[PDB]
Amino acid sequence: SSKFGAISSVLNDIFSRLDPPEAEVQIDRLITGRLQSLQTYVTQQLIRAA
Amino acid sequence: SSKFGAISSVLNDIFSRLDPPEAEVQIDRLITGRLQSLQTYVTQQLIRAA
Amino acid sequence: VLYNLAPFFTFKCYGVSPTKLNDLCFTNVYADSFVIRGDEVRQIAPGQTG
């Protein structure tokens, strides 16, 4: 639900109210952040599995 | 090979096709991604060494 | 020889820059031309509807 520095947390509104040349770099901020938050969850499980 | 949102994956093409005031944000996306890919590699070696 | 007219009011480029145009090496080029009114010049951009 967090925006992670973007303008919205839903993907459908990203492709609605802004130019198509900016939509590539705007949604690319969100996928890196969600991949970062997924990288934080796994590296806590490696500690817990030890 | 990952582009991380940049227009190319080779650093000799960013500087040879566009000005210096614009490559400062294009390459900053590449550097902060390649530096993240190296921090994930070392933090997995500490798990294997333990 | 392109820099001959003073009111070249649109010369900004997307993937390249005017300074680096003389040091590149293009695979192939095409030149499309048409005549439009002055209000529709800004209507030519990637994704810019009008």
Distance from CA of B14 to the nearest CA of C (A): 10
Tokens found for residue C7: 């009111």
> Using CA of residue A49, residue A44, residue B46, residue A32, what is the dihedral sign?
positive
Written as one string, the DSSP assignment of B29-42 is HHHHHHHHHHHHHH
Best mutation target, B39, B40, B47, to test chain A (most A CBs within 10 A): B47
- Angle at CA of residue B43, ends B42 and B48, nearest 5°: 90
DSSP state of A30: H
Give the determination technique.
cryo-EM
The conformational region for residue B15 under phi > 0 = left, psi -120 to 50 = alpha, else beta, is alpha
Cα Rg for chain A, rounded, in angstroms? Answer: 14
What does the alpha-carbon distance between residue C3 and residue C5 come to, in Å, rounded to a whole number? 6
Neighbours of chain B (3+ CB pairs under 8 A): A, C
Tokens found for residue A44: 């806590």
